[PDB]
Every structure is written in structure tokens, then in C-alpha cells.
Design a binder for this molecule. Sequence first.
Ligand SMILES: Cn1c(=O)ccn([C@@H]2O[C@H](COS(=O)(=O)NC(=O)[C@@H](N)CO)[C@@H](O)[C@H]2O)c1=O
Ligand SMILES: Cn1c(=O)ccn([C@@H]2O[C@H](COS(=O)(=O)NC(=O)[C@@H](N)CO)[C@@H](O)[C@H]2O)c1=O
Ligand SMILES: [Ca+2]
Ligand SMILES: [Ca+2]
Ligand SMILES: [Ca+2]
Ligand SMILES: [Ca+2]
Ligand SMILES: [Ca+2]
Ligand SMILES: [Ca+2]
Lengths: 424, 424
Amino acid sequence: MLDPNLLRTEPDAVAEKLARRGFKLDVDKLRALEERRKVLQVQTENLQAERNSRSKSIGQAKARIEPLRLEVNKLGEQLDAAKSELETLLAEIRDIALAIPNIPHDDVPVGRDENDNVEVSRWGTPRQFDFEVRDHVTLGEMHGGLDFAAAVKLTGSRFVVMKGQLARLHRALAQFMLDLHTEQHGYSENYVPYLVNQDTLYGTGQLPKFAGDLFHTRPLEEEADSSNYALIPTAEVPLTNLVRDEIIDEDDLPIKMTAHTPCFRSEYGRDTRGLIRMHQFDKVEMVQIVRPEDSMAALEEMTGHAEKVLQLLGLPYRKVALCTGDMGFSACKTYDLEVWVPAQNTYREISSCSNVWDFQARRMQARCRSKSDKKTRLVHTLNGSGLAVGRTLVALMENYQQADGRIEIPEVLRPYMRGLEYIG
Amino acid sequence: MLDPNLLRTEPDAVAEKLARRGFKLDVDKLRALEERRKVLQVQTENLQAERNSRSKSIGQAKARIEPLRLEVNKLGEQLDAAKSELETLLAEIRDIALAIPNIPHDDVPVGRDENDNVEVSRWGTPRQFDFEVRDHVTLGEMHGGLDFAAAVKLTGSRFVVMKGQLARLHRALAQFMLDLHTEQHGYSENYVPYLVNQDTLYGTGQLPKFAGDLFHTRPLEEEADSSNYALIPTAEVPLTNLVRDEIIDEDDLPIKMTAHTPCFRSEYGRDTRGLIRMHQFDKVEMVQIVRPEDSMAALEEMTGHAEKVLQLLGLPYRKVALCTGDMGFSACKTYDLEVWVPAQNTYREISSCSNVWDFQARRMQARCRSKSDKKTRLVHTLNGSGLAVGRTLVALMENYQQADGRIEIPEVLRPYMRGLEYIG
Ligand SMILES: Cn1c(=O)ccn([C@@H]2O[C@H](COS(=O)(=O)NC(=O)[C@@H](N)CO)[C@@H](O)[C@H]2O)c1=O
Ligand SMILES: Cn1c(=O)ccn([C@@H]2O[C@H](COS(=O)(=O)NC(=O)[C@@H](N)CO)[C@@H](O)[C@H]2O)c1=O
Ligand SMILES: [Ca+2]
Ligand SMILES: [Ca+2]
Ligand SMILES: [Ca+2]
Ligand SMILES: [Ca+2]
Ligand SMILES: [Ca+2]
Ligand SMILES: [Ca+2]
């Protein structure tokens, strides 16, 4: 959510910044609804005042009454109707305001799509192979460790069953990422719900615009009106909402959180084969709750935390600053890490690191204050993959493959694999 | 599913064994539907034969035809109607047969409920405290590590947010269990889908009788008729279904599988406070696919594997043989492990270990064969908690608490906690 006062005082300037994302704000419709809202607000608050007054006239008459009793019930009918009308108009203005993406930061290059994104840095040298490169799918079949057909039988398409040593390697990856961020990077570990409510989804921006990208659960019989849940598309959703309706002491900031969770999404034709696009995938998420003036330094730090995973694993990658047209809804500034994928002869996204500014903090009412201060202010929120675990397994398998199909275990993972050097 | 031939040849003996579970099989209704089914089966298969014959009369006439063309379309109408009627009757017989629980094994003591269960063994001596025992909820609040209120905000009741060192301890527990079973007990590790289809749920016995105990997901827009899924209530569901529609070589048995997953259930008034009853909980599951003659020896072995977790963690427990009236739907024989819970002054279930016999194997069409053999036979299936991770955390916190609220880390977990001796 954008600052309502910023929409009221600078709508054409807001519209101009949003135009860079390819988003067209309907200033006229929004203005026409807001002008009508002010008329109905006055009518309603006048009705509220007259009802409260005639109610008080009854209280002093019933102590010192049917003609006044009928008048208060007639006024009560009219006010309830007036409030219902105003609330429908408020919901309509809300539907527009909550579908507005975040204003891009001035650091963000202007562009229409992913082809306009700018490479910032590059690390490592993609390996030169002495044999024909096998993809992770072929390697998974050779070890009998990645079974797509069994997952179609159990569930359907875009699911996988991992078996044996490759399942153990996938686990070792998540353990290594969690230990790195909690031991070296200052993140606190968390176990979170994998099902969340509507308030949580509005808070981080999945609602109202991206309901179709979620798996929704039908309400429970014994919880009929309180269990309309959705599976989390990322640990960012429950972790960021931990500060919803909180006033944090500024001395307690930054709040750095990490979690390892399955991620459920329903986004065809693109990446039909393998682990790249899945309905369920594991991801080690990093979330930072910071002071408004520290968010840009925190973005650089958190991106470096995700880069450290790829460097210790010895996986060559490139760092890309996303353009205005390729950014996600909540982001004001994003860096993507793209890992070398040998069988695809290109770099593929493995992490997305964002500064959300006060966008989710406004929706959530997540505030901070210095003990002295007469008023609070909204915090800033940041989130980044450190990393997507299935895509790391793809990168690891393809980059560490041996001529016979054996997978060399990266040195940093060997302590997590009981010192094992090769799979197979 | 029970053997259909066993219901046809010994219905009163089947009914008598089921009576011990408190289940009343309607032999009369089942017999009346089956007698009618045989009448409709003859009528239909006669219509099939006459349609196939008159179709063949057209093929030889169109080479050597309207009076015969009208006759085949009239017969086609009648057969489609006859098949539709028969299929409705088959579905009705199926609804009864698929709601029949498993026949108890003769080893199982006869009883009505949990008060008729028999203690087999006991291990360890419950600790005597020099202070008032705090429950895990109070201990969680003291460390700031178990937050129920934040989970209500994120989702609703029967969810938890674990923060910091207690979240790390919960993870260390699951890592220790997985390593024990894969390194010492001969189980192969697996990554499974946490959403499953209707076939999978029928296969392990959740369907048709326990749909209300599940969280169901609404179908996806782009997968309208193939995505009616439910969240898994246990890793037993996807793991056991891995052998659905398979013919296994008997030399490849036993197939021993393990997985660590969240478990989603919707079962009020009982265990309102804490981690004992939750909508989401982690569990390390053990599944065995064995030869029919090895299932009873496998039950003893798998129960010992779950006991080994509690012994290495130094958690006193009791082993209980469940009576006929306290067994779960699929089980023919079950042992429950009940861990000492200091704040409750009793033993509480932490594991349920079952021999399912050929019940799920029949539903799934999971078979085995010796290379010589002219026919196959159904395998046996077994499943057991090694263990429920949230309930292990309860047991660990309460049994290892210090006077000031500090949690002593059990010796076997110290390598999984970087050598840390105490939380706090
Ligand atoms: C398997 N798979 C997918 O199917 C889709 C995405 N990803 C990876 O997830 C990373 C993070 O996704 S995101 O870009 O939408 N950003 C977030 O979720 C934020 N909370 C930051 O993590 C992508 O970069 C993909 O690599 C999959 O792995
Ligand atoms: C948190 N919580 C619950 O809310 C309910 C049960 N449990 C534990 O789960 C164990 C296994 O559940 S079961 O008895 O239904 N059996 C199975 O699911 C089989 N697949 C074997 O694991 C119980 O023994 C409870 O300890 C919870 O922890
Ligand atoms: Ca501080
Ligand atoms: Ca992106
Ligand atoms: Ca975001
Ligand atoms: Ca063998
Ligand atoms: Ca039980
Ligand atoms: Ca069972």
C-alpha cells in the first residue's frame, strides 16, 4: 500500500513513477470515487451525531417516551443504510489502492522486461566439460534419485519424489544454508505455519491481486468462519507478518529472521522438464525488519549473504539489478542472482533480493519508535532467497557431474554428508 | 480393503472378528446389493454381446444397411443405460467395502477403548524434581521461543511459531532422527509431495471414511479437473503409495523408507494448551514394504527403531499394545510408545507403530513375485513414527528443564547443536 496522503497531494507524480513499471493508475476514477466518498462521509457522520443526540434525549426523558423512541429507531434504520452504502464505496476505493504496486526507487534502471535488466557483477568461471553435459533430470534418473513419474502418480505434474542420496543432498543444502545465516550472518531461526489467513496475505501483497497464484484450503467443519487459508508461496509471508500491529523499540532493530520451508505456487510451456518450475519447492528465506534509513545498506548486506552461499558452494553466478518492468509487486529495488546451469548454457535465477521500503509495513501497521519520540514511523522490510533449495540442487548436480554420472559433493557440504566425496 | 472372496465365503466369521473393534458389518444389505449386482451383470454382459454381434453384422453387410444401423444405435442406448445403472450399484457396494476397517490380528487383546490397552514394557525412571515443574508452554514463553499468539495472528488456533534456539532444537531433533534411521536402521531417505490426489488417499485408507480429518485444496484454474488435492496427515500417505500398481521382485524386499515432513490434520476441549494436538506438526516417518511372511518380525524391528530414538535421547517411556477398540482403521496390530511428560504426571503417546497386513496393498495393487512364480501376491505394509517431532520437543523441554528454566541439551543432540550444553 502507498501512502494515502502521497496519492492525495502528488497523484500525477505518483502516476509518472508507476508508468515506469508499465502500471497505469486511473487518477480520474480514483478522484471521482474519493469526491463522492467525502459527500457520503459528511452525510453519515451527521446521521451518527443526530442519532447519538436523540439517544441522549431518551436517557434524560426516561428519568424525568414513545414519540422519541420511534424517532431513534427510524434514524437507526437510515444510519445503518448510509453506513452500508459508504462501506461499499470504501471497499471499491480499497480494491484500487491495494492493487497499486510499489513505487520504484530512483536506483532502479527504467525498462519494460527482463531483457532490460542490468548485470552488476559476475563470480566464478563456468566449467569446461570433456564430455556431453547431462541435465539434472538425466542425472536423477541415472542415480534413481529424482522421480517425476512417481510424483505424478502420488499427486500430479510439477511435483517430485527424491529418493536416497539425492534426497539426503537436498537436505544437506538446506542445513548448510540455515547454519550459515544463523551462525555467521546474524539471522534468528524460525519454525512457521505453512498455512496462513487472509490478513497475512493482504499484509505481504499476495492479496488482492495474486489470489490465483495460490493453493487455497476449504474451511474446516469445526472452524467454519475462521479457517479460509492458503499455503505459503514463500517464508517471507509468515516471517514479515510477525511484526504486524507491533510498535518496535528502534534499539531492537534490525530484526533478522530466517526459515526453511516448502513453498507452494501455481503460476505453461516454459521449463516443462525438471526442478526449475515446481508447485512445491524448499527455500531458505532471509527477512530483515529495519529502520527506514538503513534499508538500502541492508539490501547490499542481504544480497551479499545470498552470494556467500554460491561462493562457498563454488557455483559460478552473475548479479543482476532488475529494471522497473521486471520487478515484483511489493519491491522498490531488487537484485537477482543467476547461477550457471551447464545443460542450459546460461545463467538461471536462484535468488531474488528486495527492499520493500514501507509498502508491507503500511499494510501491516508495523512501526518503530525511539523512547523519546512523540510519534512512531513505519519500519522498512526486506526479503531474499538464501537460497531456493531445489534450484541449488539443479546447479550442484549439473556443475559437479563426473563423466560416469557421479556427483562430486562440494567441499563445504562434505561435513553435512558424513565426509562423503561422491554420490555413486 | 478386505479380500472380496473372504467376504463372499466367510461373511459371518469376518463380521465376528470386526465385532471386536466395535464395527458392525451389515451382512444382509451387502448380500442384497450383491445378489442384485449379479442379475444386472448378466443383463449388461448379454447386451454387450448382442451389440458386439450386430456391429459385426454391419461390417460384413457394408462390404457385401439402414435397418441394421438403427438396431445398433437402439442397442447402444440400452447398454449405456444398463452400464450406468450397474456402475451406480457397484459404487454403492464399493462405499460399504471401502468403509470396512482392517481385521485385527489374533495377537491383539480384545477391548473397547484406550483403558483396555496392555503395557508390554517400560524404560527409564521419571526424574524427581527439586522445584515445581513448568510445562513446555511456560518454558517456551520464558525463552521467548514458543509463540502461540503470533501463530493465531498469522493463521489461527492450533499453530505455533518457534523462534531462535528452540526452533534450532526442533530442527536438530528431526536431523538426529533422519540420520539414525538412514545410517543405523537401513531406511532410505525421501523428499515427498505434501499435497496428494484422491487415488493416494484411497490407497492408504484416509478415503472414503476420513475426508473431514483433512485440509483440502480448491482446484487450480489451469488444472481444473486434475488438482483436487489434500495436505498429507502423515508421510505414510505418499511413502506407502510409492509401491501403488507395482510388481516388486521379492529379492528387492524389504523396501524401508523414511521421510521428515509437516503433517496436516483437523481432528475439541482435549489438550487445548501446547504442542500435543496441532493442525501442523513435523514427524519423521518409517515405512516398510515387506514379504507377507515377514510383517510380524518387521513390526518388532520398526518398534525397536522408534524406541532407540527415546533411549538415545534419555526420555523414559512405556510400550503399549493397543486393544481391538483403540486401533486405527488400516491397522491389524499396533504398538504405541508413550513418553514421560513431567508437567502432566503421566505418559503421553509419541509414536504409533502398525502392521497393516495386505489392507493398503489390496487398495493400491502393490504386489511381489519370485522370478520362478506363475502368480504374484500382495505385499504387507508397515508404518511407525520415529518420532512425532513436536511431541519429542515437549518431552525434551519438560524432562531436561533446570530450576531457572534453562533447557539442558541431551548428549546425543549436542553434535547437532555445535556442542551447546544448555539453551539459555
Ligand atoms: C521451483 N521454483 C519455482 O517454481 C519458482 C521460484 N523459485 C525460486 O524462488 C526464488 C524466490 O522467489 S521470488 O522471486 O518470488 N521471491 C520471493 O519469494 C521472495 N520472498 C524472496 O525469496 C526465485 O528467485 C527462484 O529462484 C523456485 O525455485
Ligand atoms: C501434534 N500431533 C497431533 O496433533 C496428532 C498426532 N501426533 C503424533 O503423531 C503420531 C502418529 O500419528 S498416528 O497415530 O495417526 N499414526 C500415523 O500417522 C502413522 N503414519 C504412524 O506414524 C502419534 O503417535 C502422535 O504422537 C502429533 O504429534
Ligand atoms: Ca539492540
Ligand atoms: Ca523476479
Ligand atoms: Ca517481495
Ligand atoms: Ca536384495
Ligand atoms: Ca492410536
Ligand atoms: Ca495406519
